[PDB]
Paper text:
To investigate the architectural parameters that dictate the substrate specificity and site-selectivity of a Rieske oxygenase catalyzed reaction, we focused on two Rieske oxygenases, SxtT and GxtA, which are involved in the biosynthesis of paralytic shellfish toxins. These enzymes share 88% sequence identity with one another and selectively install a hydroxyl group on adjacent C12 and C11 positions of a tricyclic saxitoxin scaffold, respectively. Each structure showcases an α3 trimeric architecture, and each protomer of the trimer contains a Rieske cluster in the N-terminal domain and a non-heme iron center in the C-terminal domain. The trimeric quaternary architecture places these metallocenters within electron transfer distance of one another across the subunit-subunit interfaces.
To investigate how the native hydroxylated substrates bind to SxtT and GxtA and to identify global architectural differences between these proteins, we solved the structures of SxtT and GxtA with β-STOH bound, as well as that of GxtA with STX, bound to 1.79-, 1.79-, and 1.74-Å resolution, respectively. In GxtA, STX also forms extra active-site interactions. Here, the addition of a hydroxyl group at the C12 α-position allows for the formation of hydrogen bonds with Ser159 and Tyr255, explaining the previously noted structural importance of Tyr255 for selectivity. The remaining GxtA interactions are formed between β-STOH and STX with Asp239 and Gln226. In GxtA, there are only two recognition points for the native STX substrate. Gln226 and Asp239 interact with the guanidinium of the five-membered ring of ddSTX, β-STOH, and STX, and Tyr255 interacts with the α-hydroxyl group of STX, which is installed by SxtT. The most significant structural difference between these substrate-bound structures of SxtT and GxtA is the orientation of a loop that connects the β13 and β14 strands of the C-terminal iron-binding domain. In contrast, the two-loop orientations in GxtA extend away from the active site.
Numbering used by the authors:
A (entry chain C): 1 to 296, 305 to 334
B (entry chain A): 1 to 202, 212 to 296, 304 to 334
C (entry chain B): 1 to 299, 305 to 334
Amino acid sequence: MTTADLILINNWYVVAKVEDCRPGSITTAHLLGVKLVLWRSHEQNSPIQVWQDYCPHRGVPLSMGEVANNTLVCPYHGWRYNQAGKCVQIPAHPDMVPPASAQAKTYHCQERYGLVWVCLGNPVNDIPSFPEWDDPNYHKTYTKSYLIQASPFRVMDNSIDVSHFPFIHEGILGDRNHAEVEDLEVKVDKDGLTMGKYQVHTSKFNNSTKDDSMVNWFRLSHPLCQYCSTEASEMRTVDLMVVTPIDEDNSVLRYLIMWNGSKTLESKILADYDQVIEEDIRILHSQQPTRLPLLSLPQEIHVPSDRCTVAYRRWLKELGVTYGVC
Amino acid sequence: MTTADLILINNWYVVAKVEDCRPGSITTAHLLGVKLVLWRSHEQNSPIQVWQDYCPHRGVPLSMGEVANNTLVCPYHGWRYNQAGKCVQIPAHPDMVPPASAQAKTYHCQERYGLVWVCLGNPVNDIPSFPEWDDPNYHKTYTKSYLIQASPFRVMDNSIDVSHFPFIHEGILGDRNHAEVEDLEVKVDKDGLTMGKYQVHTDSMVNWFRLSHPLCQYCSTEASEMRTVDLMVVTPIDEDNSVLRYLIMWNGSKTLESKILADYDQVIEEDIRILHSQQPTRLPLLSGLPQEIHVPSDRCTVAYRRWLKELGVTYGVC
Amino acid sequence: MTTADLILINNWYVVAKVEDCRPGSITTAHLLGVKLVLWRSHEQNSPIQVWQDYCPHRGVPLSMGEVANNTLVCPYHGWRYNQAGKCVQIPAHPDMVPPASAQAKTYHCQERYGLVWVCLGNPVNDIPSFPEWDDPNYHKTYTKSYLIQASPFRVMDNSIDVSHFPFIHEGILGDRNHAEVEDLEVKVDKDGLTMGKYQVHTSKFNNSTKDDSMVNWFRLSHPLCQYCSTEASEMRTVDLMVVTPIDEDNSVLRYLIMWNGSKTLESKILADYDQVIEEDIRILHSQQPTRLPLLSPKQLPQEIHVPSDRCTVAYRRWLKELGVTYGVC
Ligand SMILES: NC(=O)OC[C@@H]1N=C(N)N2CCC(O)(O)[C@@]23N=C(N)N[C@@H]13
Ligand SMILES: NC(=O)OC[C@@H]1N=C(N)N2CCC(O)(O)[C@@]23N=C(N)N[C@@H]13
Ligand SMILES: NC(=O)OC[C@@H]1N=C(N)N2CCC(O)(O)[C@@]23N=C(N)N[C@@H]13
Ligand code: FES
Ligand code: FES
Ligand code: FES
Ligand SMILES: [Cl-]
Ligand SMILES: [Cl-]
Ligand SMILES: [Cl-]
Ligand SMILES: [Cl-]
Ligand SMILES: [Cl-]
Ligand SMILES: [Cl-]
Ligand SMILES: [Cl-]
Ligand SMILES: [Cl-]
Ligand SMILES: [Fe+3]
Ligand SMILES: [Fe+3]
Ligand SMILES: [Fe+3]
């Protein structure tokens, strides 16, 4: 049984890309300790069902079955479950109405921004906003998924931290000889956590061109999804960073990236993200304790450039998070 | 050393094939949480000793030793144990009589049907009967062993289940156009659990089976021109792991042996795919989160769960 | 960060050889459940720092950093720690004085006999003596380190046991035609555990005794370091056996060996030790329970003891008397 807090259960999380879930497909995923099955009927534009991956007859994963005639069919005795999760046929007794108990545990699913979002509980909140999604001046791309052996809150803590840039992203986002961090603007309010415009010192790459001089800001409406905005020399790049909380100690990381420069930059964008992400994963894998320490092994130390990661920890306690934190 | 229920401790289980326990040999097995050593002296027709795999001096497995002169010799300090498990020689003190505590933990062992049977407790029952063993009209063959990451009681539950045949054994035991299951006849007695004759569809065979005890099943199938029986024996390694073996006998042509073994292998591997996936691992008795649902074609597997609860089984179940 | 008994925490243990800690190097070790980082400046004859492998800012291992300008630099935000473990530079705030909390957890470290000794607590004893260290008639050599999946107290128990020699070390320390064990002399007092001189059967002629044997004795001042002496044919070999208690169930084993015979014996000595150690590891890995059983007023079945077990019984009795509960059962 999931020990996640209600505040986490009642939120939306990404579990897959829509483009990887074809009609007729069966996909597995994991969310807040729960094993999920995602399936679609073979019809074009069919919805995605997201259920607990478990047949209540003899305990077989329904994901080992098959999709047929708009049902998911268990492999073991062939019980057929309709789109609402109700068993509508037991082959051993074809004239018998299946018992009302023969029902899959179903969850909420929405497709948004080409991503599959799931809510295991009763969705109080909305899916986070992504204003550029419907802007045709912006192209889109998606990173691969990254499976990370770290708490989802440590993953997000690292992506709120800006002072590490000249050290583990040396050569892309700065150098150890330019590591001073200016005062940061941070607010935690009704819109969530927002880091105000911050100047990022970048390493020179193309000697023919002007300095990149990027300015970054971001906002988290909810604690595992970050909207990030970067203004560079002649282009804006935005992204939605979504962390899937597999369990307390493990995460999946994905980005949806949009930019209003040339579509031909997609390869460079994906490779630059991959380089930065893997540098962060080396740190994340190593951090102890695995779960994120909240405010109160020696205690964490905080300096002024930690203002936003301190605010993140404060927010998590205000939210009542106990899962994935310590 | 085992924490299994007395009702399980006092029953017989197969742990090896006799052909693998040659004179002079040392082999191992694992039963109800206990590590076992099996050994024989080099004399022809010597008996098989089955002991806990543990030298009580400094805790080394006796299976790392050697068989010498009707004794098993521990590799660490060379203490020698005779066929009764009594230490008869301590090399550091060759004239000393070894203390009474210098004694291997021994278990009951009987060879039957070409199989090595072990009882860790006090045998209250005989080894299950297999009447065709003495019928020379029937040929015999043995499957290989199958190591399964599932509770032994889930392994047997899967074998008692007949309604899954059309879905995971299509072409050998079932037909997806004939998935309906007729009314089943099941009885639980002091003779054990018995399922009455049942039509299989694959032609049309008639099958029945009986379990005298919960982890050994006698199965009988009559086809057009042939009867096939088997003894299915499941070694309960622990609560969560099993060894599966079959002794198969049939009264048709001797030439059918390789096809019989191939068909069994196909069916067994199809079942193992399901067994490895089932959660929870241990077999739920009557009373993933939701509780089991039962329909009429589950009559025999429901009776099996009821029998285990009546017997007081708590090991390997939930 | 350790559940070890105070009697173990306040003792010295070897965690590395000095030759594996070159100037500028970062290495790791593990002691009583604590992850350690060992580092030195690039300077000639720089000291060895041994710290908990942990940056208290955001919990990254300092062993993932780099040595620069006689400081250890954390890879994540570049905090620089001096040889005393004090943070002297926070690059995000270059003119700010680091808070007093910005300090690595440091441990007592000493180099002796070419080995790196560490005490995680407050050392009550000196490092064991090794008198031949100063003697110019003795050559020295070092085995490699051996990682063993067994309790450090089982590792030492196996090294105090002599009656197994004819059975698992046949041809180096005994043979099965010479398996009888003489009455053993054992004492446990202020000096620790001592086994008195006893005869080990070999294959080479001893010119002092006029048969194929050697004379061995050993002493443990503390439960995980053994001084061992062996004499045959006018040549003497001594060693210091040091066990690193990684945690309750795992060990590192090292030997420092000195001998007064030919320098050409060195490779033979190393090969003999490697064979004997691997023979013992085969047994150690198989033993159950993993932790060393102590003696109990009571009655898996309890161990059995015979007279040739006198010194390993004394070892178990000593550990109970000392109050050891970690790595034993
Ligand atoms: N050019 C490039 O790789 O940018 C990465 C992109 N921009 C940041 N400032 N990052 C800091 C942390 C981070 O996760 O890498 C990210 N945060 C979000 N949302 N997207 C990333
Ligand atoms: N032709 C073939 O593979 O038959 C398998 C054989 N016969 C059955 N009806 N089975 C159903 C289940 C089962 O375990 O496979 C088995 N039960 C026993 N005792 N033997 C097997
Ligand atoms: N020639 C050779 O390999 O000798 C091993 C050497 N000498 C002993 N008598 N041993 C007995 C046990 C043991 O651990 O192998 C050891 N104990 C210590 N201190 N050093 C080893
Ligand atoms: S386990 Fe799913 S139909 Fe029986
Ligand atoms: S451990 Fe078996 S003889 Fe010593
Ligand atoms: S974690 Fe070491 S400097 Fe930040
Ligand atoms: Cl469909
Ligand atoms: Cl579609
Ligand atoms: Cl019906
Ligand atoms: Cl023999
Ligand atoms: Cl035959
Ligand atoms: Cl049985
Ligand atoms: Cl001590
Ligand atoms: Cl000494
Ligand atoms: Fe980063
Ligand atoms: Fe089957
Ligand atoms: Fe030894």
